[PDB]
Subunit: 785 residues, 2 copies
């Protein structure tokens, strides 16, 4: 069904081999090699300007929208200034098991040399490493927590697109100028406001210059164009790129061209991801409505949305070799929000919502993450449509409950009107578009490794050493309640090592690594004259990535029913069994696995511990604030860390074997949800899903035959609405066969469009490692409920 | 009668040609050329270490103290990273008319030209240039004021030698380590403290490593040394440099080695000067007594004090070609304080004060400036000795009244015990040693130029632009009071412009240019974890250098006389008189010249205006605080700006002619004090000399025949004590023959040791330009009072 233009654009994205680009690396390295005493924030604006002035740019034949990250299709942009892993991990850059990257031409050496070696020891990531105390290094080694935003900028940019779409850069530039002219330096620290406004001005004029570069390219190409239809596309492009982003868009294409330009510019200034694109069906609606009444047909807009979506799919955010194994498929976590409600609470679904969903019906892209906002008065037509496409084309959208999200946000200090205008930076975490500086990556926390360390009263078998504290020798435990307290004591100590590292790191950013473009249109920054790292936003909070709950819940139900009720074994016998990885006593392993109930089967005796753990985690981290004064929130998600962190957790009492992967995110352990998906969501409702203010990341998988047709929607819609009626937040669907997934393993070339939801992002199954593929195939296939 | 060793050392300093050095310029430029995202304060510290690990060093055979700025005698260390003037003024650098410098090879181009080109547009001075508003540029151009600290660091450092000499660097390193260990980063700005302590550690361990380079070098020269006296010196030097500044010195020579290392380290980290050396006769006394008890003769200390004084006289602080002619001779303004009171108010003189004065009797060096602290209980021997030496030698103990300084410092928020430990950074401004961060260079202010603009109701005629405001039309002045109210409005306008620019600049240092070493032992910095620029000292205040006062006083007298009293002309006629430089009306200029009283002759009619003017400038600047929260204070001192600011002021009503030098500093104008030196100090008594906190700089010359014999060290007291009882602060004399200073121009190489006090600094007359020489020769010669 898709247009021929979109079929070629899609093909270029999906099939051009991704090549490492040296434009940015070369030009940034040359700018920072000019000695300077300019203040480092002004220097960084000026380095951004210099890079956008000299980098390569192309306009592909089929493109109606100007701009790519590179000067060729599928360029992979580099950040040797920020990323220290580009030194340690350099040799595997073009041999990865998750991220197919190639050099263009054995200018692998221009980068080995002239650049990565030149930066040795002086990258941002090298500064971040100096903030890690000696005791923390074993903690990081065995995977108790990770050191987030230590090789990326603070990322997670949420531009005020609702207002930017009406104003254009020149509005904010003039604001900074007006701010600058009435501002007095009375105190040394007042220079901060001067630097911030100036830097933001320099950077906004930089992007305008960048757009004018595409306009001139477009215009030269137009002069040599014989096809009248293309000649007109290019004169319209050149005209668009002289109008926008500097000025308000006049047309639907200009509005998309402004948002893309701004998105792209943010992507290139600093290493990082997770920037959102706002509520496209909302801020775009005046343009669709106007030009539609002018005669333009639905497909005019469809092709633009498709090119727009493909602009994002082409982007990369390369991470250290290790984050690329646990984040396989390279999530950008760049959301577009659809549906939800307006300020006054009435339905926000519109015609453009449907136009967009019908595009996804015809062509799905790995990114962006499409975030569909359910609410009680959601248009039923539109809701079921979104269900249709999640099952059919597969991949998107995930589904989100406005009533749960607005509760989280109000509990975080937002007003009702603000809460109604929420989106995501990251996997699933709610936030108020345009007015939040959400830190999605302080790091991850591994409750199960902490438990492992508690089962040995502070020593770690894996790396053999004392890294925790004495929470209590295991023989002294009278009850499940006694071991709960011993855990809470170990959890409290490690939660505080982690928050110390995270607070230190976010503070260091404030003295080394700005993000100017991402500040410009975050509400607060221009008004206060403070970039994001200097507390520019009115709202900061940090989500702790809690790597799973299922294994902890199950190993605690297993200890209660098998150690303290039925007394099948003391606890010293369990550590010996666990230490010895069940070598021999595999009869006993089956006792723990079958004789005690497992999470996700709507079994209150195991389900009671979900409430307990979410609560201790919330309580433990909430005795601190982050380095910008905001709360620490609970998020349950592992991405591929269930596998990678699992590799470092010995045998757990739930029956899980040493080094085997954990459950996936907040879902039950593989094989244990034997009672259908209404029971899985019923189990998650014992967490008190109004508590974790940055969400429970939930994966569900259905057999495509059983959820076929129109009654098949009714099954999915029921499972959904039942989740939401219990304050469920997020639900995420794969409608995929066990057999269909092995066919793509044996014959990847014939199944290069099966799109899987991994965690809070989607990826092409053939792009994923074989180890990660089998971990997605192990997921439970719900046959109904 | 001075030791052969001190004669040789003296010759090596006084006669080796200053040659521009490229170690710092080379090594620093090299370092800032390695790209780095490290924080710029940490980077500076590491830059500092790197330079100290690779600069050339050398040890003269006649030296017992290690360390020089260069690897040869009289090296001139360059600061291309800071000084913007190095580009625009490169060409004249080696053809200067009051500096006299030379390149060794064709390293003019070799390196130093190419190095400055590398830095082009990226020096600290370039960044400071951005802080000047458009409308301020004409004001700078015609010399209404000066952009202070725009090509230097905040400088003006004042180490806590009293404690340092007892603790060594290790004490402070360990205090940084302890504080770091306790410190939590709970807010982003808490990282400031981490960065401060770490940078101070790096910088102090760098100076220790540097000391070791000298130990290793001295040891090496010991073993090849065939003379057992010099061999023993070298082995002492080596043991010394393994001891200081890391640890508390144990000996007079070590205490001196420590002081010199610290001073020298500060001078090399960043451009600038005005660092004081403390009360040497005080903190050194325990070592002198213990070693004199042990049989060391006076001559042992006399030769260390001499070499130490020469170590400082060898130093350079190169300024731009403009400052290079208004500050002729390269003032370093590095004071050693002598005498004064102890904490309890008792006389602080001791044997070491005399030993020190005896050295100056025998050998005077241009720097350090020596400030003798007089007070009502001062030892009569010591005081009269100090006078003798000021007379029979390049006058160096200038004289300062403790009662007047302790009054200034009390009005500045200091305690009585604090104010007794006072010294100078700058020319004459009082501060509390170890506990003050005094800005001696916010910039100068030209009240006479402001007066010009007032006479033209806001216009500057030379440039024809209305750079000021509407003071009022001169044709409307009913009274001398009307003119005074007019000048006040103009003064307020330009004073606010000046303060705006100085405040912005001092803010600028706090985001670009640290002074780490000078922060280390400033009380407050290590305690608070703040370098000086981040408000580390408990006391910051800023002296506005007011370019003279005499011409203003005389002009207002001349106007009250000839315009308003005896109606010789009207205000419009006076203006035309002035706009034409008195052309064809020399009768009239003689009227204003002689029919109206002048300043410095104890005539109340004119002297009443000195109170009004000093009050107006104080009141006007007290509307504001500096950027660190401290007050602005008045410093009446022209330096040699009376020539270079003179050239931008038209004829004035006191009879001075367009382009003509102003009166020098806080003195009366050439020719006007005709009634003796005792009357000049009575005239300055109508200033109310308790009001200019930071002092009026007073120059007085005497005919050598008159004040000879003991009826000089009896008649000298005379004019001294009567200045002090009248609350006089500063009384600094030069006793040159006037016929001696003319013969010393025809035979330069024959009067190479003639040292004149030229505006709070002191220099050898055969090192000044002719224009600055013939102007120093127009100072009133007093034949007695
Ligand atoms: O690493 C990141 O980008 C964030 C994404 C997710 O919200 C949790 N960690
Ligand atoms: O320019 C300077 O270095 C200071 C010195 C003295 O206080 C007058 N101004």
């Amino acid at each position: 069904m898709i247009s021929k233009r979109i079929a070629r654009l899609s093909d270029k994205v999906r099939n051009t081999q991704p090549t490492i680009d040296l434009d940015r690396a070369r030009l940034i390295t040359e700018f920072y090699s000019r000695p300077s005493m300019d203040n480092y924030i002004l220097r960084r604006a000026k380095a951004f300007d210099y890079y956008l002035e000299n980098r390569e740019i192309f306009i592909d034949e089929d493109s109606q929208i100007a701009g790519h990250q590179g000067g060729c299709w599928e360029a992979v942009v580099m950040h040797p200034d920020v990323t220290k892993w580009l030194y340690d991990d350099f040799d595997t850059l073009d041999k990865r098991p998750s991220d197919n990257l190639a050099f263009r031409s054995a200018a692998a050496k221009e980068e080995l040399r002239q650049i990565v070696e030149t930066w040795k020891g002086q990258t941002f990531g090298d500064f971040a490493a100096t903030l890690v105390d000696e005791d923390m290094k074993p903690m990081l080694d065995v995977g108790i927590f990770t050191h987030g935003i230590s090789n990326q900028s603070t990322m997670n940019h949420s531009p005020d697109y609702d207002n930017l779409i009406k104003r254009g850069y020149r509005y904010y530039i003039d604001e900074c100028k007006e701010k600058l002219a009435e501002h007095q330096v009375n105190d040394v620290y007042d220079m901060e406001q001067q630097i911030a406004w100036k830097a933001m001005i320099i950077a906004m004029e930089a992007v305008i210059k960048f757009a004018h570069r595409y306009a001139d390219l477009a215009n030269k190409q137009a002069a040599e164009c014989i096809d009248p239809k293309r000649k007109e596309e290019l004169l319209i492009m050149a005209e668009n790129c002289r109008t926008v982003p500097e000025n308000p868009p006049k047309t639907f294409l200009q509005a998309t061209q402004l948002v893309w330009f701004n998105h792209l510019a943010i992507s290139l200034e600093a290493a990082g991801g997770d920037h959102n694109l706002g509520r496209y069906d909302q801020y775009m609606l005046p343009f669709f409505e106007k030009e539609t009444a002018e005669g333009k047909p639905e497909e005019y807009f469809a092709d633009i949305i498709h090119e727009f979506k493909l602009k994002v799919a082409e982007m990369w955010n390369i991470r250290c070799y290790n984050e690329s194994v646990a984040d396989p498929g390279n999530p950008l976590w760049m959301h577009i929000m659809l549906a939800g409600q307006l300020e006054n609470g009435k339905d926000a679904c519109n015609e453009l919502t449907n136009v967009f969903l019908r595009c996804m019906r015809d062509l799905q892209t790995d990114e962006p993450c499409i975030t569909f906002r359910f609410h009680p008065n959601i248009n039923e037509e539109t809701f079921r449509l979104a269900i249709e496409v999640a099952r059919d084309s597969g991949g998107h959208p995930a589904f989100y409950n406005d009533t749960a999200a607005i509760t989280y946000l109000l509990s975080l200090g937002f007003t009702l009107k603000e809460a109604r205008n929420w989106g995501i930076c990251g996997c699933i975490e709610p936030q108020v578009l345009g007015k939040t500086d959400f830190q999605s990556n302080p790091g991850y926390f591994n409750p199960l490794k902490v438990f492992d360390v508690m089962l040995h009263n502070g020593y770690d078998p894996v790396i053999g050493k004392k890294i925790g504290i004495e929470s209590g020798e295991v023989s002294s435990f009278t009850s499940i309640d006694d071991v709960m307290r011993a855990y809470e004591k170990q959890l409290d100590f490690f939660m505080e090592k982690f928050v110390t590292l995270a607070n230190r790191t976010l503070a260091g950013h404030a003295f080394t690594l700005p993000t100017i473009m991402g500040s410009c249109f975050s509400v607060g920054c221009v008004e206060k004259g403070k970039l994001l790292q200097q507390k520019g936003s009115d709202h900061h909070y940090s989500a702790v990535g809690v790597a799973g709950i299922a294994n902890m819940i199950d190993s605690f139900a297993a200890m209660e029913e098998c150690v303290f009720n039925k007394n099948y074994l003391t606890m010293e016998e369990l550590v010996r069994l666990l230490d010895t990885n069940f070598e021999g006593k595999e009869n006993m392993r089956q006792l723990l696995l079958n004789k005690a109930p497992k999470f996700g089967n709507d079994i209150e005796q195991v389900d009671k511990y979900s409430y307990w753990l979410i609560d201790a985690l919330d309580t433990s981290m909430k005795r601190f604030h982050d380095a910008q004064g905001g709360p620490y929130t609970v998020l349950v998600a592992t991405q591929a860390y269930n596998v990678e962190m699992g590799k470092n957790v010995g045998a757990t009492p739930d029956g899980r074997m040493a080094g085997t992967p954990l459950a996936d995110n907040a879902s039950p352990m593989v094989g244990m949800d034997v009672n259908g998906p209404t029971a899985v969501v019923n189990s998650l409702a014992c967490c008190d899903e109004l508590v974790p203010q940055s969400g429970l990341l939930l994966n569900q998988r259905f057999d495509p035959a059983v959820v076929a047709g129109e009654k098949g929607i009714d099954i999915i819609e029921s499972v959904f609405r039942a989740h939401f009626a219990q304050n469920g937040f997020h639900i995420q669907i794969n409608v995929l066969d066990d057999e269909t997934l092995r066919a793509a393993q044996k014959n990847p070339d014939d199944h290069r469009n099966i799109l899987v939801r991994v965690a809070g992002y989607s990826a092409y199954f053939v792009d994923l490692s074989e180890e990660i593929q089998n971990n997605i195939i192990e997921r439970t296939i719900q046959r109904g409920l």
